[PDB]
Amino acid sequence: SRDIPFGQVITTCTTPNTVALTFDDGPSSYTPQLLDLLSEYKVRATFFVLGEASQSNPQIIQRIRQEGHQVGSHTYDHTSLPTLSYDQIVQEMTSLESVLQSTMGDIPTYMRPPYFDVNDLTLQVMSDLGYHVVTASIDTKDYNHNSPDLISQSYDKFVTELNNGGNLCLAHDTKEQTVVTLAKMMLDETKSRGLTVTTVGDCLGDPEASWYRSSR
Ligand SMILES: [Cl-]
Ligand SMILES: [Zn+2]
């Protein structure tokens, strides 16, 4: 199977006719409802999770994994990594590894940088630690439309960027309107198109055995 680069920004799925719906900054109190919706549609998603959220909601981390979704790293503290030293960037990653090792029994090989901010130093750390670096090719901007009257604008951006060939989509399951309204709109549209709605690792051709590794 494919070799997938480490320490190099990945924006787009490679498996034809796939789409990866992804959710950042959780788990949150809305994540369980989103998991219910994903199971109704029989799809898989990817969750790039944070430190305090994972420590507060370990049972949601376990439920994400048991229902076949992928857990990726979003750093512990959500710091813009180019504002940090090499050692500090390492610590942002390994501190979340301690949390995830204890909650889900392994650690991710996929990460998403806060705000998509990268520089050479950040990419060097991710290469050295063995992380695939994922940003996005669809960005819902749902954080800025988190109200019933605004959330349709995130769907319009989603559809337009999907039509432009985007296939790796950023939303936040910390936002109520993303879970209660936008996710169903995205899932209906991807179902209508007959897309394979799957994890980031799967949409890159990576077997699930490679989305995680044992403790360092
Ligand atoms: Cl440094
Ligand atoms: Zn984030």
Author numbering: 24 to 239
Quote what the paper states about this structure.
The enzyme crystallized in the space group P432 with one monomer per asymmetric unit. The conserved Asp–His–His triad (Nε2-H97, Nε2-H101, and Oδ1-D48 atoms) plus a malonate ion (O6 and O7 atoms) from the crystallization solution and a water molecule coordinate a zinc(II) ion to form an octahedral coordination geometry with a metal–ligand distance of 2.2 Å. The malonate ion is found at the expected subsite 0, where the acetyl group of the chitinous substrate is normally placed and hydrolyzed. All five conserved motifs can be found in AngCDA, with motif 1 harboring the catalytic base (D47) and the metal-binding aspartate (D48) and motif 2 containing both metal-binding histidines (H97 and H101). We found that Aspergillus niger CDA strongly prefers a GlcNAc sugar unit at its −1 subsite and shows a weak GlcNAc preference at the other noncatalytic subsites, which was apparent both when deacetylating and N-acetylating oligomeric substrates.
Chitin deacetylases (CDAs) are found in many different organisms ranging from marine bacteria to fungi and insects. These enzymes catalyze the removal of acetyl groups from chitinous substrates generating various chitosans, linear copolymers consisting of N-acetylglucosamine (GlcNAc) and glucosamine. All CE4 enzymes are metalloenzymes that share a similar fold and five conserved motifs forming the substrate-binding site. This binding site is comprised of several subsites, with subsite 0 binding the sugar unit being deacetylated and the minus and plus subsites accommodating the units toward the nonreducing and reducing ends, respectively.
